[model samples]
Each structure stands twice: as structure tokens, then as C-alpha cells.
Target: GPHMDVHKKCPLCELMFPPNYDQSKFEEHVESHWKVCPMCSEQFPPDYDQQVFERHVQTHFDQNVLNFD
Candidate 1:
């Protein structure tokens, strides 16, 4: 009998994990490479556009900051 086992590859890291790998841990590992927006709680990939994200955050400040003082 040939030893055969199906495995999943992590798209972010290109590392392989066993079929029985813990789903939560695997997701945590994948999300480690993600960028989260502090203002809106939006998630972006590591390669997300920095300027676009900054502009989005600025919009939040623009809408909310005016209420103060």
C-alpha cells in the first residue's frame, strides 16, 4: 500500500498542512498575514493598497471628528 494523505496548502504562506489540522489554528495562521482597519474593522490582505486604506480611515475621521469640540 502506498502512503497517501491529502493535505491543504496555505495560500498566504504556501505551507502545507495535514488534512486533520486544527481549523482554528490554521485560520489564525492565515489571518496573521492580514491587515485590519482600526477605524472600520475591515480586513485586508497583506498586499492591500496602503493609500486606499488610509483614505478609507480618513473618511471615518472626517465623519466622526467633526462631532467633537
Candidate 2:
């Protein structure tokens, strides 16, 4: 069965908090610092290094992964 969506606002700002973090603590952080996007933002902390990501992309090329559409 589908359940109700329970989402929370960021603690540091009004932006939507990701599902893994606590709502109350998240809100508190929003008040303290500037928020930025994780993807495409160099200043933002990265989930993977640029070099590693580049290598992964290159591997896809080596494997001939592509979408003609």
C-alpha cells in the first residue's frame, strides 16, 4: 500500500531536507550557513571526487554505453 509522504524542511534554511536527516536538527543548521546544491556546485561537499567521476564516465565510453535518443 502507498503511505503518506513525510518530508521535512531544512534546519538551516527553508529548502527541503533530504529524507535521511532529522527535521528539527536540520532546521537549526539552516539558520547558521549558506545552503548550496550538492551536484554541480564545486563549493558544495562532494559525494565523489571529480577525477573519480571522470574515470567512471570514461569507463562507460570504453564499454560503449550510449543513448541514441
Give the winner by TM-score: 1
TM-score of each: 0.45, 0.27
For candidate 1, what is the TM-score? 0.45
Off by over 4 Å in 1: 1-7, 36-43, 47-69
Give residue 43's lDDT in candidate 1 (0 to 100): 80
Q: lDDT for model 2, on a 0 to 1 scale?
A: 0.48
Q: Which stretches of candidate 2 lie over 4 Å from their true place?
A: 1-45, 64-69
Residue pairs in steric clash, candidate 1? none
The local distance difference test score of model 1 is 0.72
True lDDT of residue 47, candidate 2: 42
State the C-alpha lDDT per candidate: 0.72, 0.48
